[PDB]
Amino acid sequence: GIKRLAVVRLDVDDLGAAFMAGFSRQGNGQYSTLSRSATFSRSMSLFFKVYINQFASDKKLSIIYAGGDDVFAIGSWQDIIAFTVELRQNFIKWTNGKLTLSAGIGLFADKTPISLMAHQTGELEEAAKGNEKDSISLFSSDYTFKFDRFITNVYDDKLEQIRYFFNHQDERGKNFIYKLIELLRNYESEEKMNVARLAYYLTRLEELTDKDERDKFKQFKKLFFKWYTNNESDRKEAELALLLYVYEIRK
Amino acid sequence: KAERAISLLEKDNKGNYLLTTSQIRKLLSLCSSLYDRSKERKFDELINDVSYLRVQFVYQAGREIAVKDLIEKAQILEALKEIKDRETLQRFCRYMEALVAYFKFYGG
Amino acid sequence: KAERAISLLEKDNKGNYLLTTSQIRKLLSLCSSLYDRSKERKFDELINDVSYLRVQFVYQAGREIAVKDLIEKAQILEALKEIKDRETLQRFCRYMEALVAYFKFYGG
Amino acid sequence: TFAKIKFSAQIRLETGLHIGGSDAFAAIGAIASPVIKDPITNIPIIPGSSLKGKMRTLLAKVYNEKVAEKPSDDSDILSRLFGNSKDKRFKMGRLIFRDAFLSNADELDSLGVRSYTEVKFENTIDRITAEANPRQIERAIRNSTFDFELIYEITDENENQVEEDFKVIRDGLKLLELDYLGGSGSRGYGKVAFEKLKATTVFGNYDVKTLN
Amino acid sequence: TFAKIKFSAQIRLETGLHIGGSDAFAAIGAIASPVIKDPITNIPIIPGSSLKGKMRTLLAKVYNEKVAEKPSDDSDILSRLFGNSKDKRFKMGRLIFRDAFLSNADELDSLGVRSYTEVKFENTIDRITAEANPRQIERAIRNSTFDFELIYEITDENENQVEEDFKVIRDGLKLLELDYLGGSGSRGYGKVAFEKLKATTVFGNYDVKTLN
Amino acid sequence: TFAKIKFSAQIRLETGLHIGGSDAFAAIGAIASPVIKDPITNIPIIPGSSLKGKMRTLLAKVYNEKVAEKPSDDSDILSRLFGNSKDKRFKMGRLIFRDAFLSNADELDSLGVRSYTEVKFENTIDRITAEANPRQIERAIRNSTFDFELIYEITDENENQVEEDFKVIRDGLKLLELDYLGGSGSRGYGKVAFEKLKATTVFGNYDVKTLN
RNA sequence: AAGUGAACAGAAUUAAACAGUUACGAAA
């Protein structure tokens, strides 16, 4: 890690709308009791304030402005990225998968004024509303996935099955990953040339490395070819997964 | 340009290619040293390297059996006559790189 | 230069050429050793090798039947008199390679 | 008062050396350790970072006594020539080199040149087995000039080492010719030769005393 | 303190040897074992990589007490002369060679020669048939000089071991004359001979004591 | 430990032989296989490649236990003397030859000679007819000597059988005297004669045992 | 003074064709 930090603003959705007429399901009951709506907002208010301090153990964080709407977290980015998606998993089980959640992880520089640091991290949530209501942005306004898709594809197999494959090829071959994140930059130019050039710099990482272990690069070569040539929108998942691994081991 | 290079190069004959990347360092040395030099000066000035580039695809074609079977399929001698302009030569330099990337993916 | 050398060399007589590229290593050893040396010093300095180069195309033309039939068709003795400058000699050295690369293209 | 003394020289490479550069970003033939060149043309330009560090290393071993443990911290008589990152009295250095380019292209093509760089074949022996790992490197041509200009400037105020700074630069450039330059030059690849070492005044504020 | 001792000598080839150049990279005559030459002219030059690896090989088999398993790791009395990639005390060596060029062209043209390198014809016997596989090689001329300069320098601190290092360099150059140099020297092609072995001082900081 | 034994001898030619030089590569006379000579002078020198392929062939048919079918694979007592392209224990050969030059020119002109090479008229008869294909050859001089040197060295470990190797070299050189050397010596052209077979120590690390 | 045309095959091959000690150093 380096001297950076991440700023996330968790804001649950499906709260301002469908709040008064969201209990209709049967023509028998009226579902308009005031006590039904009182316990609906009180049960969720306990998780976004009291239960946050309980899950803050064994980690260095600092909650700012606690509430049942929008919060403000700041600290070391070595765990906020992993804790933001982990906190959402506890809200889905509490609601049985009925209320979505959104946020906005934003990284900036060190010793920056809050007037513009905390203002630019909020535009990622508004820019992510172009799709529908369940989306989130990472660094810039280009990695606008489906929020929940980040853990089912990028954090699923694109992040767990890479922590011990390329780790053995680090140090002596750390500069070999810089050519991979840069090759996927020029994509709107020519599509036929972007595919043939990728097949040249990828096969060179099999013979140069240690050939004593066959199961060291075979699992990484097959997954890297399928994750790139399958869909136009799927290439953004493999590009973001390889970028987060560079910041993991650095300095 | 680069889409047909994955099917025409794969369709060959017997597997286990005995030709690697070290024995082809003679005919592939002038292709990379031409695209980076034709952009500086004009095309009508370099008249000695253009005629010598065709000789490399003829003398090395009758010595090894792993050379004639690739030129006739990829049509290398056919594209050497259509080129005549500096902009057209830039396209032929990019087609040669497609026959090398897909060759090392299936073997070496 | 290189376009008319692919048709004049192919038009011969009976097939199965008995002459290989190893029995003509006498008249071809001085032409390759002159181009790399004429590009360093001047042309008026080397006067003992210019007159000796023409003798190789005459002494070896009466000792083998596979030599006279190639000089009279390719017109080798005609280009030996037109040359007189160092830049003109560089053009004749590149034309000699066409009679060797294209000769083994159809056989050996 | 404040002049810009320029020491124009012609670096003649008596032996082809090797300098490591960017790999797997040039062309498809990025093997044999391709030397970095011009980002626009194909003229092999020499970097200026390899000259400022090599000249300071060979000079900080005869003009000083304390062993240099970390950069920007060795004596004081030579710290003002290149620079000091830990000192506050001075920051900018007086010695400014330049990324010289091969200006010999005006007559190099007339002598018949195939390429500007050639690939050299080498190998190694493990001293217990036969030949293994046939590696390969890439070198440059021989006898090539370069437009090298030394941008020198004085601080006007502390102007009393002019007669002393001239004998240091002349001794540093002459000693550099007796040592390799670049990378992997221990086998005899570097060894430069500064040809035509002259001085001139472009700004016009100080006279000319010495020439070589 | 810090001197630049130069051991100038003339390498006289008593027997024509062979050096494997860059195969499949030259012109149309890339067969018959192409010998590396000058990238600009046609004067054959000898590389310096074949001298540093051969001199260290013959030296690491008489002045040691342990079989060298891997390079850059054999004894210690000779590791500081050529270098060490696994040591943490010293890195840069004290012996720098140079790509010597054929300086015998001042009188070679007066005798009237055909070319700088000739082609020798050889073959082999399969011990069951007559002539098979008519191969061919390439050799150089005989009795040719080469400007060989040995760049020697001390690190000031290593001053009490100067006379001990002179007997090692002299023993390595004399023993190299009784062994083939270059390549394909098993049939009797190498065997060099250092002529006019003298020493001089260029920087001027150490006295002149040794000579032959 | 590491010694350099030199077996100086004089190869006296009792009969003029013929060695096929570089065909179709000579100067003013390239008729009937021009014999290879010196690239600088005119004295015909004998190549060292013929002394390695002929001595090993005649020795691999008397000191072996299996019929050989390919080079670098015959018995084991003689594989370490010339080399082995399959065994990983040893690769370099302990026997180093040298292109022996004709040192008899200091007194050859006193006896009144014409030239160094002459044309011998030798043809063939087709039995069924008269003279057919009147070919010819080119032989050298008769009763000439050559300053041959045999560079021998040990690898320290190869010390407990030094006397075993002396009887192999002495038996191989004596057997070569009763056989033609060079090429097309079936008509009585070769048959060498090693004169003054002595040994000496140049490096000085091993005692002198043999002499005659 | 006397038919004189060195004839006929293989045209460089089989190992090995990036191995390792390793990465923003001290200010805001």
Curated annotation (Swiss-Prot), chain A:
UniProt domain GGDEF: residue ranges: 3-141
Disulfides per UniProt: none
Subunit structure: Part of the Csm effector complex that includes at least Cas10(1), Csm2(3), Csm3(5), Csm4(1), Csm5(1) and mature crRNA. The Csm complex is elongated and slightly twisted with a maximal length of 215 Angstroms and a diameter of 75-80 Angstroms. It has been modeled to have a central protein filamant of Csm3 subunits along which the dsRNA helix of paired crRNA and target RNA binds. The filament is capped at one end by Cas10 and Csm4 and at the other end by Csm5; ssDNA is thought to bind to the N-terminal HD domain of Cas10.
UniProt domain comment: The N-terminal HD domain has ssDNase activity. The C-terminal GGDEF domain has the cOA synthesis activity.
Function: CRISPR (clustered regularly interspaced short palindromic repeat) is an adaptive immune system that provides protection against mobile genetic elements (viruses, transposable elements and conjugative plasmids). CRISPR clusters contain spacers, sequences complementary to antecedent mobile elements, and target invading nucleic acids. CRISPR clusters are transcribed and processed into CRISPR RNA (crRNA).
Family to which this protein belongs: Belongs to the CRISPR-associated Cas10/Csm1 family.
Additional remark text: Encoded in a type III-A CRISPR locus.
Annotated protein name in UniProt: CRISPR system single-strand-specific deoxyribonuclease Cas10/Csm1 (subtype III-A)
Organism the protein comes from: Streptococcus thermophilus
Upper lineage: Bacteria, Bacillati, Bacillota, Bacilli, Lactobacillales
Residues of the full protein shown: 507 to 757 of 758
Swiss-Prot record, chains B, C:
GO MF entries: RNA binding
Subunit structure, interactors included: Part of the Csm effector complex that includes at least Cas10(1), Csm2(3), Csm3(5), Csm4(1), Csm5(1) and mature crRNA. The Csm complex is elongated and slightly twisted with a maximal length of 215 Angstroms and a diameter of 75-80 Angstroms. It has been modeled to have a central protein filamant of Csm3 subunits along which the dsRNA helix of paired crRNA and target RNA binds. The filament is capped at one end by Cas10 and Csm4 and at the other end by Csm5; ssDNA is thought to bind to the N-terminal HD domain of Cas10.
GO biological process: defense response to virus
Summary of the function given for this chain in its UniProt record: CRISPR (clustered regularly interspaced short palindromic repeat) is an adaptive immune system that provides protection against mobile genetic elements (viruses, transposable elements and conjugative plasmids). CRISPR clusters contain spacers, sequences complementary to antecedent mobile elements, and target invading nucleic acids. CRISPR clusters are transcribed and processed into CRISPR RNA (crRNA). Csm functions as a non-specific ssDNase. Base-pairing between crRNA and target RNA to form a ternary Csm complex activates a ssDNase activity; target RNA cleavage suppresses the ssDNase, a temporal control that prevents uncontrolled DNA degradation. Viral RNA transcripts probably tether the Csm complex to the viral genome, recruiting Cas10 ssDNA activity which is able to degrade DNA in the transcription bubble, spatially controlling the DNase activity.
Species of the source: Streptococcus thermophilus
Signal peptide segment: none
Keywords: Antiviral defense, RNA-binding
Coiled coil: none
Leftover remarks: Encoded in a type III-A CRISPR locus.
InterPro entries (alphabetical): CRISPR-assoc_prot_Csm2_III-A
Family: Belongs to the CRISPR-associated Csm2 family.
A Pfam family the protein falls into: Csm2_III-A
Record's protein name: CRISPR system Cms protein Csm2
Keyword RNA-binding found: yes
Swiss-Prot record, chains D, E, F:
Regulation of this protein's activity per its record: Target ssRNase is inhibited by EDTA.
InterPro entries for this protein: CRISPR-assoc_RAMP_Csm3 (IPR013412), CRISPR_Csm3_endoribonuclease (IPR052216), RAMP_III_fam (IPR005537)
GO molecular function, one term: endonuclease activity
UniProt keyword annotation of Hydrolase present: yes
Keywords associated with the record: Antiviral defense, Endonuclease, Hydrolase, Nuclease, RNA-binding
Highest rank taxon of the organism: Bacteria
Short name of one Pfam family: RAMPs
Biological process terms in GO annotation: defense response to virus
Coiled-coil parts of chain: none
Enzyme class: hydrolase
Documented EC number(s): 3.1.-.-
Cofactor-binding details, from the entry: Endonucleolytic cleavage of target ssRNA by the Csm complex requires a divalent metal ion; Mg(2+) has the best activity in vitro, but Mn(2+), Ca(2+), Zn(2+), Ni(2+), and Co(2+) also support cleavage.
NCBIfam families: cas7_TM1809
Note: Encoded in a type III-A CRISPR locus.
Similarity comment text for this entry: Belongs to the CRISPR-associated Csm3 family.
Protein function: CRISPR (clustered regularly interspaced short palindromic repeat) is an adaptive immune system that provides protection against mobile genetic elements (viruses, transposable elements and conjugative plasmids). CRISPR clusters contain spacers, sequences complementary to antecedent mobile elements, and target invading nucleic acids. CRISPR clusters are transcribed and processed into CRISPR RNA (crRNA). Csm functions as a non-specific ssDNase. Base-pairing between crRNA and target RNA to form a ternary Csm complex activates a ssDNase activity; target RNA cleavage suppresses the ssDNase, a temporal control that prevents uncontrolled DNA degradation. Viral RNA transcripts probably tether the Csm complex to the viral genome, recruiting Cas10 ssDNA activity which is able to degrade DNA in the transcription bubble, spatially controlling the DNase activity.
Name of this chain's protein: CRISPR system Cms endoribonuclease Csm3
Organism (species): Streptococcus thermophilus
